[PDB]
Design a protein around this ligand. Structure first.
Ligand SMILES: NCc1csc(-c2cccs2)n1
Ligand SMILES: [Ca+2]
Length: 223
């Protein structure tokens, strides 16, 4: 997260870190045994880390649970990043509490202008590289479809939305990938892509989660 703020330990209780020897992506806990992330975060050997603030220090609220299976969306295209969504099942159910909690799926799509919370352990620099240990947060509005399409000609599908600031300075970045965009207590987006970070006229692009609720529910119901 570039130009954000330190969230505070366990203030974003649905935020997960995906770890394969190191943090490589964010995710969102949607029930005791399932995590939503980006399809571009797919790899083998994933351990889900819940209750994290400082990802380099065991602070006492963590739960570390290996993934039993990952399910990339059947229509995910890695070139265009269309349908950039994946489900991860935990080998055992997380113990839910005030610091490790699920986030609700949307019942409706959030509109442009809606104010949301984006979070992650991604790069905090727009030019350099600096990775934080503690969770960073950014309040950002959803942008209009037209402004999103004008920012990225030929690249925005009906499964994507832009959020952030056209002036730059405040954005998600590498390592925030797969993490949450939450609006009114619902998971509306997944950190998907962009062009650099916090650059003028290049806001973050996010997977439009409301399009996938039926797939998520049916997949969970049979897996
Ligand atoms: N600025 C949006 C965004 C989200 S993930 C991301 C990057 C991934 C790799 C380099 S940059 N950029
Ligand atoms: Ca920790």
């Amino acid at each position: 997260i570039v130009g954000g703020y330190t969230c505070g330990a366990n203030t974003v209780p649905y935020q997960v870190s995906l770890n394969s020897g190191y943090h490589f992506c964010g995710g969102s806990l949607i029930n005791s045994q399932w995590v939503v992330s980006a399809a571009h975060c797919y790899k083998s050997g994933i351990q889900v880390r819940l209750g994290e603030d400082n990802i380099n220090v065991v602070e006492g609220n963590e739960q570390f649970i290996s993934a039993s299976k990952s399910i990339v969306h059947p229509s995910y295209n890695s070139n265009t990043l269309n349908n950039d969504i994946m489900l991860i099942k935990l080998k055992s159910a997380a113990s839910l509490n005030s610091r490790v909690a699920s986030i609700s799926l949307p019942t409706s799509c959030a509109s442009a202008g809606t104010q949301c919370l984006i979070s992650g352990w991604g790069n905090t620099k727009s030019s350099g590289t600096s990775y934080p240990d503690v969770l960073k947060c950014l309040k950002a509005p959803i942008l209009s479809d037209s402004s999103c399409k004008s920012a990225y000609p030929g690249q925005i599908t009906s499964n994507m939305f832009c959020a952030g600031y056209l002036e730059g300075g405040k954005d998600s970045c590498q390592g925030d990938s797969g993490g949450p965009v939450v609006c009114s207590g619902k998971l509306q987006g997944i950190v998907s892509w962009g062009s650099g970070c916090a650059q003028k006229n290049k806001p973050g692009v996010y997977t439009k989660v409301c399009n996938y609720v039926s797939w998520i529910k049916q997949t969970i119901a049979s897996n």
